[PDB]
Design a protein around this ligand. Structure first.
Ligand SMILES: CN1[C@@H](CC(=O)c2ccccc2)CCC[C@H]1C[C@H](O)c1ccccc1
Ligand SMILES: CN1[C@@H](CC(=O)c2ccccc2)CCC[C@H]1C[C@H](O)c1ccccc1
Ligand SMILES: CN1[C@@H](CC(=O)c2ccccc2)CCC[C@H]1C[C@H](O)c1ccccc1
Ligand SMILES: CN1[C@@H](CC(=O)c2ccccc2)CCC[C@H]1C[C@H](O)c1ccccc1
Ligand SMILES: CN1[C@@H](CC(=O)c2ccccc2)CCC[C@H]1C[C@H](O)c1ccccc1
Ligand SMILES: CC(=O)N[C@@H]1[C@@H](O)[C@H](O)[C@@H](CO)O[C@H]1O
Ligand SMILES: CC(=O)N[C@@H]1[C@@H](O)[C@H](O)[C@@H](CO)O[C@H]1O
Ligand SMILES: CC(=O)N[C@@H]1[C@@H](O)[C@H](O)[C@@H](CO)O[C@H]1O
Ligand SMILES: CC(=O)N[C@@H]1[C@@H](O)[C@H](O)[C@@H](CO)O[C@H]1O
Ligand SMILES: CC(=O)N[C@@H]1[C@@H](O)[C@H](O)[C@@H](CO)O[C@H]1O
Ligand SMILES: CC(=O)N[C@@H]1[C@@H](O)[C@H](O)[C@@H](CO)O[C@H]1O
Ligand SMILES: CC(=O)N[C@@H]1[C@@H](O)[C@H](O)[C@@H](CO)O[C@H]1O
Ligand SMILES: CC(=O)N[C@@H]1[C@@H](O)[C@H](O)[C@@H](CO)O[C@H]1O
Ligand SMILES: CC(=O)N[C@@H]1[C@@H](O)[C@H](O)[C@@H](CO)O[C@H]1O
Ligand SMILES: CC(=O)N[C@@H]1[C@@H](O)[C@H](O)[C@@H](CO)O[C@H]1O
Ligand SMILES: O=C(NCCCO)c1cc(Br)c(Br)[nH]1
Ligand SMILES: O=C(NCCCO)c1cc(Br)c(Br)[nH]1
Ligand SMILES: O=C(NCCCO)c1cc(Br)c(Br)[nH]1
Ligand SMILES: O=C(NCCCO)c1cc(Br)c(Br)[nH]1
Ligand SMILES: O=C(NCCCO)c1cc(Br)c(Br)[nH]1
Lengths: 205, 207, 205, 205, 205
């Protein structure tokens, strides 16, 4: 679209994706949620889980807003994530780099709401010893900004989803939990939030 | 080519590959087809299919058209996909990133008709438990735009081809189905069209 | 050289590697030949060959020619392949991306005749069932331009031999064939030339 | 911040990441600590350890300092490591390239103090023969600047915490040591500082 | 370094890394040596060696020299290899791409002497059948410029070090040889020199 074209030239003009879009004394609040789609495998020897997650991440980038009157038809845009600031979310218990399965694009509202919803396959460190028991194995997968404290990036949880879980596969879900936390670290003087996704699973039969 | 050199400079001038080439209240209709070339392997433990396919994809980019009078000989061009807008097609049941086996180039017509025909090797999540049975295993491989709804990107099926299927290999094809749908998500108004490629296969030696 | 440095500045000035260097109603004729250096492995289950090839591709780019009088010493130069137009040759039966083992450089004449001679390791789909037989297994490895027809890119064979073949290794060569063909597709009024490298091999003893 | 863009624009237009930020006859002192998070696996045949480390690297880069008057709110910034000079630390006994698990960003103070804290998964050459013994296997993992001598880059150790060690897993820690040294090479006559991380571990039971 | 920053600006000014730094009809002499650090594994089926080498490559790039009077403190600089011309050395018997383990930097003197000393892990084609014998298996690993002949790049060998060989590991060294040769090819008027590293090893008792 010619109205869409005219906007991308502006949404680029003075945009630096390395800059966290904080506004005078206010953190960027980032909404976060993980959905376990499939437990691919477990390594009982090496103590690891091979898992496929759907991530729901949303925030506001004030540098990404536009007047819908200036660009009529343009309600939303699909922007490549490389073109924009994305939260520096770390998987604290990941033992492999993330494999992003879905197109690396984000949707952007006229008010600057960024929605990045990737499917990630990753391997995590976990005590899988009790996978063959009724109690099952429990993985506490922790995620959070690696470099931004609470006053810069406010991590918040959003409504989760266990409808996406693959019905076939050796593993059945005993329980799933998501909890947001905040702690002070001896290092920093400033606090840091995190979201912990907790899974309890077991081998079927 | 000489006019070809002059055209590539212009076909770049004001082109943004991140912009969907929709024209005033009309979606971009993308034609899509998938041809199963070979089922590489199955993981009965992990419930996965390793598959090779030929993707037939095409659309009209109204920003890519040119006057053949301005560029005589130039009927078509081989453009790298990275230089142009391509549909953001997601493999909904993929459990590995796609491995593109062919050159990453697209053929473009004087009227903006782009044809991207890659060979992809990818691993998908599938219930392969019945692979050793006469009924066989069935994989419902779903594909569609990740960010564009039906009124921005109109996914359409084109006539598919099962002549490309490798005659050797452990697996024989019981049946192949192609269906286009429009799914509504709780998230949003406006539906999301998808093409589901359904395969029924079985081990040749299952006796 | 101080002419070589100036030559590279000019050989870049108005050069687009995305443009096929066809000149007025004439296709670019590309000379091609494969030499099987080693059959690494066979997967009898998955029906695949892991092979190491030496490719000899050579063509003439008219935009790359220069006056030797303008650049005295400069007879030839080593240009990175990424800097120049290379034929879009596809391995039709490849089931893995090519692993290029040699430096990614091509040699270029004062008349613009380019020579690209890489060693590639690639995995191909092949009926390897008869590898343990006296008749042996036969692989018909097809190669050709993915996007250019006969009137744009004229694929031509160069006679290759089998002197490069590794003498050790489980596999002995029963026969090697190379044939150039021209195929028509329902799509296109103009045909697509290809070179098929055919191997017949068997496990030793 | 509005000044964050100002900051990133100038600390891009004038900063050369290739330049070691030494200031006149004074080396850059780099603080270094390694924390063993998990021993993933051991290869008794090939004599290798697959390990997950948390690295703590800090130094002062004088080219990255600013007064707060220059960038009002701006106290710190998350800069991509590719934008900065980072110590050229080599893992002398690594037999695989490092897999960096965390976002590749570093924190910079207004007084030029850089903090790079990556989680790395890497495979190292080690004599793992005694892993099944009470004495256990000992890995002497050596790290240091590959190209900078003592008078350019002053490697210094910091206090390492073994609090991060994964409680589950086949391997228990008998002992962990860190020693900084300065070696002489026949090449140079200026010494090369290094930190050797020594682990003694054994299979549980 | 204030002068260092001033030096990197000039060392960039008109530098093209694609250009071999030959001076008016004189070849660039490159010093080369290889040091076997460890034989990782052998594949008796596929006929391959997995090896870790330390490479010592040195050459003089006349475009890289500077007056030490113009830049006081600056005796040497660590430049990323990507920023400068490096010899296009091919591993003629490599069946995998090289895995470079060490930082990809080279040291450069005030007189243009470049020293690139990487640790490479690579897999080579080799007749490993006799690895379990007293005679042992012999690998003739050939290396040389892929595109430059004797009059452009003069390959020379330097001091061979076997002190770096890992004492643990299944394999003991029977013998190591390095020889430089000047091969003539039917293709070309000018000879192509090469260095062949020959190893004889065997499985320990
Ligand atoms: C990085 N770290 C905080 C800062 C910080 O620790 C730190 C900062 C500066 C100096 C020393 C330590 C910032 C937010 C994430 C948090 C992560 C957690 O600590 C951690 C460290 C090591 C492995 C796993 C997890
Ligand atoms: C991505 N999603 C739709 C939008 C949306 O979900 C959504 C949008 C905005 C907010 C929250 C959720 C767009 C069309 C595709 C669909 C995909 C499906 O989720 C999905 C998730 C995981 C595996 C397979 C498929
Ligand atoms: C890509 N295709 C031709 C063009 C074309 O078909 C086509 C063009 C335009 C529209 C529809 C179809 C050009 C020459 C190569 C050929 C490729 C071969 O089919 C093929 C595809 C997949 C695996 C093996 C072989
Ligand atoms: C690279 N070397 C020193 C430099 C140097 O030797 C050297 C420098 C210049 C010329 C010749 C040799 C500097 C600091 C690292 C040290 C490491 C060791 O060599 C080495 C090489 C390969 C594997 C393990 C260890
Ligand atoms: C590449 N080749 C020479 C050039 C040349 O032969 C050649 C040149 C032009 C046309 C045909 C052949 C240059 C120096 C190295 C030599 C390498 C060897 O061929 C070779 C090829 C494949 C695997 C291992 C070795
Ligand atoms: C102008 C506009 O449409 N703004 C919407 C906002 O009301 C909504 O809460 C947000 C998240 O979905 O997306 C944006
Ligand atoms: C993400 C976000 O900011 N959501 C809010 C929400 O309170 C409201 O229901 C919605 C609809 O206008 O838009 C705004
Ligand atoms: C000018 C020209 O050749 N236009 C063609 C058009 O007629 C055809 O339907 C389309 C798809 O093949 O390709 C384009
Ligand atoms: C893909 C497309 O747009 N096809 C149409 C079709 O109606 C017609 O038969 C063809 C030939 O001119 O060109 C146009
Ligand atoms: C100026 C010059 O040397 N031109 C040569 C040409 O005569 C030769 O046939 C071709 C292929 O080798 O390389 C070029
Ligand atoms: C590749 C090519 O074009 N070769 C031709 C060939 O007929 C001739 O023998 C050679 C020497 O001048 O140059 C020209
Ligand atoms: C201006 C400022 O905040 N400077 C601090 C300094 O006091 C501290 O020792 C160093 C390491 O944490 O970081 C810097
Ligand atoms: C890294 C560094 O320089 N640290 C010092 C340290 O002595 C002091 O405790 C700190 C707090 O002001 O800042 C300064
Ligand atoms: C100006 C200067 O230091 N030049 C030295 C030279 O004498 C030495 O042989 C060479 C290799 O180490 O490095 C350079
Ligand atoms: C690499 C090189 O050119 N080396 C030479 C060497 O003959 C000499 O001993 C050294 C010390 O000045 O510098 C020069
Ligand atoms: O690994 C993750 N982030 C680190 C960056 C590595 O390039 C990550 C974040 C989330 Br949410 C997942 Br699941 N993985
Ligand atoms: O995986 C696919 N797209 C996502 C790319 C991001 O990693 C994909 C699309 C189609 Br059609 C296939 Br087959 N795979
Ligand atoms: O795979 C090949 N070419 C296309 C690009 C793949 O990503 C290829 C061509 C030849 Br000749 C060989 Br051998 N492989
Ligand atoms: O593989 C080598 N060079 C080719 C470049 C990558 O495609 C190589 C050179 C040396 Br010395 C070794 Br050891 N490997
Ligand atoms: O491998 C490491 N550095 C060099 C990479 C160049 O390719 C490395 C450094 C440290 Br500290 C660890 Br743990 N690994």
């Amino acid at each position: 679209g010619e109205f869409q074209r005219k906007l991308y030239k502006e949404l680029v003009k003075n945009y630096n994706p390395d800059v966290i879009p904080t506004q005078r004394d206010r953190p960027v609040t980032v909404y976060f949620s993980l959905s376990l789609l499939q437990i691919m495998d477990v390594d009982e020897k090496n103590q690891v889980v091979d898992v496929v997650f759907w991530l729901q991440m949303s925030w506001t980038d004030h540098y990404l807003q536009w007047n819908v009157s200036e660009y009529p038809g343009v309600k939303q845009v699909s922007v490549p994530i490389s073109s924009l600031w994305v939260p520096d979310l770390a998987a604290y218990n990941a033992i492999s780099k993330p494999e992003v399965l879905t197109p690396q694009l984000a949707l952007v509202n006229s008010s600057g709401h960024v929605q990045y919803l990737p499917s990630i396959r990753q391997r995590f460190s976990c005590d899988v010893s009790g996978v063959d028991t009724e109690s099952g194995a429990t993985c506490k997968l922790k995620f959070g900004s690696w470099t931004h404290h609470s006053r810069e990036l406010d991590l918040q949880m959003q409504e989760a989803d266990i409808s996406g879980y693959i019905p076939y596969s050796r593993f059945e879900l005993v329980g799933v939990t998501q909890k947001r936390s905040e702690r002070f670290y001896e290092c920093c003087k400033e606090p840091y939030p995190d979201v912990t996704f907790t899974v309890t699973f077991r081998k079927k039969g």
